[model samples]
Target: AFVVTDNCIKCKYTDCVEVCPVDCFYEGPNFLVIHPDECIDCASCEPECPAQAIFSEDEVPEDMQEFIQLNAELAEVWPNITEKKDPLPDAEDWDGVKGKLQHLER
Candidate 1:
């Protein structure tokens, strides 16, 4: 499974959703998460993400590593999102910003 790490927190680029063969991503107010069990491990969405926020669970960054579990927890409650959409209002500004957990919108 892949995890959505910190770079996704406020960026919320939906490019990954369109490429996910399993439609495993869940939508939050300002981000998305892949359902760990539902992900097919096809690795299609990783490169599609403009924010470069998706990563194979094993390759997640050391500091952003908590997102592996966080993705699982949020995917359970957030609504499933299978299509692409406009990114967050300030997605470009937020993209690549480190330590964005504080700005995550639920």
Candidate 2:
């Protein structure tokens, strides 16, 4: 299964949600997660995100690896999103800012 990373934290978009063959994406207030179990590893949603936030389990950035598990945990709680929707109004403004969680650990 592919994992969504921090790059998507504040720019929740849905091209991925629309492209997912299994409808594995779960939507939250400011992010989206792919259910590890439901994801078929097909990578259908890989090229659809404008944020480029989805990465294969093998290629996920070293520092952002925790997002792999995060997808699973969040998917379990958030509502499944099978429909497309506009992104956050400020998505374009923050598209290049990877530190949306700047005040984090360490």
Candidate 3:
């Protein structure tokens, strides 16, 4: 599965939702999670992400690794999201900033 990693903690660069072949992305207050089981491994939504926060589980950055499992955990209970939506009002301020795991809002 492709994982939604730390860079997305407060900046859900949501274009990934519209291109997701399986509608596997889930919605949360501050993050968007990709359901592991539902991903087709097609990489369709990968390039669409402006934050470059989505990564194949196998390739998730070392520091952002926790979110590979984090995606699974939250996606299980978060509502499935099939449409693109507005990003967080403060998204731009958080973009490019690292160590965002601490900012995650469940």
Q: Which structure among the candidates has the greatest TM-score?
A: 1
Give model 1's TM-score versus the native structure.
0.97
Query: Which candidate would rank higher by TM-score, 1 or 3?
Result: 1
The runs of at least 3 residues in candidate 1 whose Cα sits more than 4 Å from the true structure, single-residue gaps closed, are none
TM-score of each: 0.97, 0.92, 0.95
Consecutive 10-residue window with the lowest summed lDDT within model 2:
97-106
Question: What lDDT score is found at residue 27 in candidate 3?
Answer: 94
lDDT (tens digit, per residue) of candidate 2 on 55-76: 9999998988888888888899
State the TM-score for model 3.
Answer: 0.95
* Candidate 3 lDDT, 4-106, residue by residue in tens: 8877878896999998877999999889999999998999988988888889889998777778788889989999899998888889889889888777886
Q: In model 1, state the lDDT of residue 62.
A: 86
Lowest lDDT 10-residue stretch of candidate 1: 97-106
Model 2 ranges with Cα > 4 A deviation: 102-106
RMSD of 1: 0.7
